[PDB]
Amino acid sequence: GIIEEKALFVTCGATVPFPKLVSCVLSDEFCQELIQYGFVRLIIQFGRNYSSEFEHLVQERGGQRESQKIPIDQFGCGDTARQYVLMNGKLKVIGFDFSTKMQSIIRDYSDLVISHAGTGSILDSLRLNKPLIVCVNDSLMDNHQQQIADKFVELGYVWSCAPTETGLIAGLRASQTEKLKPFPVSHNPSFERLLVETIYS
């Protein structure tokens, strides 16, 4: 914490609309809890411009925001990235349209990766040896939701969350309360079939 700054990385798949996943990571509890967990640096990635969805919810709380030259060396975001002010400055949110390897820079920089029903993003965290919280969709069978959770909890390096605006932050509470550690196995095809294919898919 002294030498390196902590950061929480959010990424979404194509399973559901991104705009809908914005409110899941800018909720009252989501922001309020993280600043007590040690995640005051929240970086949320997207490929298509959804910056209006971030500014909107800020205006829905009367907060501030500023387009800043966010260091690539530090976070990985570009100069068009926007900083959003939540929780009276206690939560700093960076939004940026990622292009190439900048999304991998922020991944390595971050401590914890959130996958909103993602696919390659799951492989990425498991490849980069980062701890992974995976939020499932509401199209997934309830039995399959628990089935995946059971095995990821057995693993102890991935945490499954329900398809709500509260299941994620519950897992982000469980990231410290419950056993959740960085994925140690660096074998590409190992977690590909083990975790992604067999269990998740």
Side-chain angles (χ1 to χ4, degrees), residues 20-89:
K20 293 180 179 181
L21 298 172
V22 173
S23 69
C24 295
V25 296
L26 295 178
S27 75
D28 290 352
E29 290 178 357
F30 187 89
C31 293
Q32 183 175 1
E33 292 299 302
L34 283 175
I35 61 172
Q36 299 176 73
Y37 297 166
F39 298 105
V40 301
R41 299 182 192 278
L42 177 65
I43 301 91
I44 302 165
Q45 79 83 22
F46 51 85
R48 292 180 183 274
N49 187 337
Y50 298 111
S51 63
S52 66
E53 295 304 306
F54 297 92
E55 181 175 355
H56 176 76
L57 291 177
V58 170
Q59 290 180 2
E60 292 299 307
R61 296 292 181 273
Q64 299 295 317
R65 80 287 180 269
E66 180 178 62
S67 296
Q68 294 175 354
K69 294 183 180 179
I70 301 297
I72 292 170
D73 287 347
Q74 188 77 35
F75 293 98
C77 298
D79 288 345
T80 62
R82 179 174 289 177
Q83 182 179 70
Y84 304 94
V85 179
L86 298 173
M87 305 306 304
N88 291 334

Side-chain angles (χ1 to χ4, degrees), residues 1-6:
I2 294 170
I3 295 170
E4 294 184 358
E5 288 290 300
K6 292 181 178 181

Side-chain angles (χ1 to χ4, degrees), residues 115 132-137 140 142 144-154 156-163 166-172 174 179-180 199-200:
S115 179
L132 176 65
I133 298 176
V134 179
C135 181
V136 302
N137 194 27
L140 184 64
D142 288 348
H144 292 169
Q145 294 177 23
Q146 190 64 49
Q147 184 65 45
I148 291 171
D150 285 346
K151 298 301 178 182
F152 283 171
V153 169
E154 182 177 359
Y157 308 120
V158 179
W159 193 266
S160 175
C161 292
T166 60
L168 177 58
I169 195 60
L172 288 165
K179 183 174 175 177
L180 183 63
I199 298 170
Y200 173 75

Side-chain angles (χ1 to χ4, degrees), residues 121-141:
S121 61
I122 292 170
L123 291 168
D124 286 347
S125 188
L126 298 172
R127 183 175 180 185
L128 297 176
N129 298 104
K130 301 288 186 170
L132 176 65
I133 298 176
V134 179
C135 181
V136 302
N137 194 27
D138 64 359
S139 66
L140 184 64
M141 187 181 288

